[PDB]
Write an enzyme that holds these catalytic residues in place. Structure first.
Site, short mmCIF file in Angstrom:
data_model
loop_
_atom_site.label_atom_id
_atom_site.label_comp_id
_atom_site.label_asym_id
_atom_site.label_seq_id
_atom_site.Cartn_x
_atom_site.Cartn_y
_atom_site.Cartn_z
N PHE A 282 39.72 74.99 -28.25
CA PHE A 282 40.56 75.85 -29.08
C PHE A 282 41.80 76.20 -28.28
O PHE A 282 41.73 76.45 -27.06
CB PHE A 282 39.89 77.18 -29.47
CG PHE A 282 38.83 77.06 -30.56
CD1 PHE A 282 37.52 76.84 -30.22
CD2 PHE A 282 39.17 77.21 -31.90
CE1 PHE A 282 36.55 76.78 -31.20
CE2 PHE A 282 38.20 77.14 -32.88
CZ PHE A 282 36.88 76.93 -32.54
N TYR B 182 28.04 76.10 -31.52
CA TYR B 182 27.09 75.94 -32.61
C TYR B 182 25.81 75.22 -32.24
O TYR B 182 24.98 74.92 -33.10
CB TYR B 182 27.77 75.22 -33.81
CG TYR B 182 28.94 76.03 -34.39
CD1 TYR B 182 28.69 77.17 -35.13
CD2 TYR B 182 30.24 75.65 -34.10
CE1 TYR B 182 29.74 77.94 -35.60
CE2 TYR B 182 31.32 76.42 -34.57
CZ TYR B 182 31.05 77.57 -35.31
OH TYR B 182 32.09 78.34 -35.79
N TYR C 49 45.18 80.19 -33.79
CA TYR C 49 44.32 79.21 -33.14
C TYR C 49 44.41 77.86 -33.82
O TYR C 49 44.75 77.77 -35.01
CB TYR C 49 42.83 79.62 -33.16
CG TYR C 49 42.11 79.62 -34.51
CD1 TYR C 49 41.47 78.47 -34.95
CD2 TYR C 49 42.07 80.77 -35.29
CE1 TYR C 49 40.81 78.47 -36.17
CE2 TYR C 49 41.42 80.78 -36.50
CZ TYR C 49 40.80 79.63 -36.93
OH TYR C 49 40.16 79.60 -38.14
N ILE D 134 31.66 83.05 -32.54
CA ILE D 134 30.87 82.40 -31.52
C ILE D 134 31.11 82.99 -30.15
O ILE D 134 32.18 83.55 -29.80
CB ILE D 134 31.13 80.85 -31.47
CG1 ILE D 134 32.62 80.52 -31.29
CG2 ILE D 134 30.52 80.23 -32.74
CD1 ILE D 134 32.92 79.02 -31.09
N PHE E 92 39.84 70.25 -36.66
CA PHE E 92 39.12 70.68 -37.85
C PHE E 92 39.70 71.95 -38.47
O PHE E 92 39.41 72.26 -39.65
CB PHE E 92 37.63 70.90 -37.51
CG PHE E 92 37.29 71.87 -36.36
CD1 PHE E 92 37.30 73.25 -36.54
CD2 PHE E 92 36.98 71.36 -35.11
CE1 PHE E 92 37.00 74.10 -35.48
CE2 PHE E 92 36.68 72.23 -34.07
CZ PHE E 92 36.69 73.59 -34.24
N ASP E 93 40.48 72.77 -37.74
CA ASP E 93 41.09 73.94 -38.36
C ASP E 93 42.29 74.49 -37.59
O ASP E 93 42.38 74.30 -36.38
CB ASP E 93 40.01 75.01 -38.50
CG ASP E 93 40.33 76.21 -39.37
OD1 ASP E 93 41.23 76.12 -40.20
OD2 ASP E 93 39.65 77.22 -39.24
C1 RAP Z 1 37.67 80.02 -44.33
O1 RAP Z 1 37.80 80.05 -42.87
C2 RAP Z 1 36.75 80.80 -42.20
C3 RAP Z 1 36.73 80.38 -40.71
C4 RAP Z 1 36.27 78.91 -40.49
C5 RAP Z 1 34.77 78.62 -40.73
C6 RAP Z 1 34.35 77.19 -40.30
C7 RAP Z 1 34.68 76.98 -38.78
C8 RAP Z 1 34.33 75.56 -38.28
C9 RAP Z 1 36.19 77.40 -38.52
O2 RAP Z 1 37.08 76.45 -39.10
O3 RAP Z 1 36.54 78.67 -39.11
C10 RAP Z 1 36.53 77.56 -37.00
O4 RAP Z 1 37.59 77.07 -36.58
C11 RAP Z 1 35.67 78.33 -36.16
O5 RAP Z 1 34.79 77.69 -35.55
N1 RAP Z 1 35.82 79.67 -35.94
C12 RAP Z 1 36.80 80.55 -36.64
C13 RAP Z 1 37.67 81.26 -35.60
C14 RAP Z 1 36.78 82.13 -34.67
C15 RAP Z 1 35.77 81.19 -33.92
C16 RAP Z 1 34.94 80.33 -34.90
C17 RAP Z 1 33.81 81.19 -35.49
O6 RAP Z 1 33.14 81.90 -34.81
O7 RAP Z 1 33.64 81.11 -36.89
C18 RAP Z 1 32.66 81.95 -37.57
C19 RAP Z 1 31.38 81.06 -37.81
C20 RAP Z 1 31.61 79.82 -38.68
C21 RAP Z 1 30.08 81.82 -38.23
C22 RAP Z 1 29.60 82.98 -37.30
C23 RAP Z 1 29.39 82.60 -35.77
C24 RAP Z 1 28.79 83.74 -34.91
C25 RAP Z 1 27.61 84.50 -35.60
O8 RAP Z 1 27.30 85.66 -34.81
C26 RAP Z 1 27.94 84.92 -37.08
O9 RAP Z 1 26.79 85.57 -37.72
C27 RAP Z 1 26.95 87.00 -38.01
C28 RAP Z 1 28.35 83.69 -37.92
C29 RAP Z 1 33.36 82.43 -38.84
C30 RAP Z 1 34.27 83.64 -38.60
O10 RAP Z 1 35.01 83.70 -37.63
C31 RAP Z 1 34.29 84.73 -39.73
C32 RAP Z 1 35.48 85.75 -39.57
C33 RAP Z 1 32.98 85.56 -39.65
C34 RAP Z 1 31.83 85.43 -40.42
C35 RAP Z 1 31.70 84.53 -41.67
C36 RAP Z 1 30.58 86.25 -40.08
O11 RAP Z 1 30.70 86.87 -38.81
C37 RAP Z 1 30.34 87.35 -41.19
O12 RAP Z 1 28.94 87.75 -41.11
C38 RAP Z 1 28.10 87.60 -42.27
C39 RAP Z 1 31.22 88.60 -40.94
O13 RAP Z 1 30.72 89.61 -40.48
C40 RAP Z 1 32.66 88.65 -41.48
C41 RAP Z 1 33.65 89.29 -40.47
C42 RAP Z 1 32.59 89.25 -42.94
C43 RAP Z 1 33.79 88.95 -43.91
C44 RAP Z 1 33.51 89.52 -45.34
C45 RAP Z 1 33.90 87.41 -43.98
C46 RAP Z 1 34.92 86.72 -43.43
C47 RAP Z 1 35.01 85.26 -43.49
C48 RAP Z 1 36.08 84.57 -43.05
C49 RAP Z 1 36.01 83.15 -42.61
C50 RAP Z 1 37.03 82.32 -42.25
C51 RAP Z 1 38.43 82.83 -41.84
#
Ligand code: RAP
Length: 107
Positions: free
Chosen positions: A99, A82, A26, A56, A36-37
């Protein structure tokens, strides 16, 4: 909501099920704004489990209608992304997101 516009067609057959792991590349940008990413820059595909609210809403509903191999432009309104709070330090309040998503395979 989320609008899905196809850049390249998938197989038209293999669609994700809730509980499957989706493997994607993506690039994200603010509509008419900055990029932004991108996972392409890292060449490490991004993986998430569909249906578990890890991502999301616009991705939950947008990728569920994509088939393996499809590449699509997803335009996502603030309430499917968001919302009024934004994402601290990166995405402002009421931002519409665009995206480019490619569904590489399911696991
Ligand atoms: C460094 O890069 C980050 C991704 C960045 C963060 C900042 C944003 C601009 C962004 O650049 O991605 C971006 O482009 C973005 O908006 N994304 C990522 C691609 C998918 C769509 C979107 C999104 O939903 O982000 C997500 C967004 C920011 C927050 C969530 C949105 C929906 C809501 O329901 C969730 O609450 C539960 C919170 C980030 C994610 O896709 C990651 C995978 C998931 C989470 C952190 C949470 O779901 C967490 O819950 C505690 C989990 O259960 C995970 C799997 C647990 C394991 C240990 C942690 C994995 C962390 C990996 C994070 C990664 C690769």
């Amino acid at each position: 909501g989320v609008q899905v516009e196809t850049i390249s067609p998938g197989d038209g057959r293999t669609f994700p099920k809730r509980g499957q792991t989706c493997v994607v590349h993506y690039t994200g940008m603010l509509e008419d704004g900055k990029k932004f990413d991108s996972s392409r820059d890292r060449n490490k595909p991004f993986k998430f489990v569909l249906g578990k609210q890890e991502v999301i809403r616009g991705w939950e509903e947008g990728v569920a209608q994509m088939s393996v191999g499809q590449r699509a432009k997803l335009t996502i309104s603030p309430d499917y992304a968001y919302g009024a709070t934004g994402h601290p330090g990166i995405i402002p309040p009421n931002a519409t997101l665009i995206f480019d998503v490619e569904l590489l395979k399911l696991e």
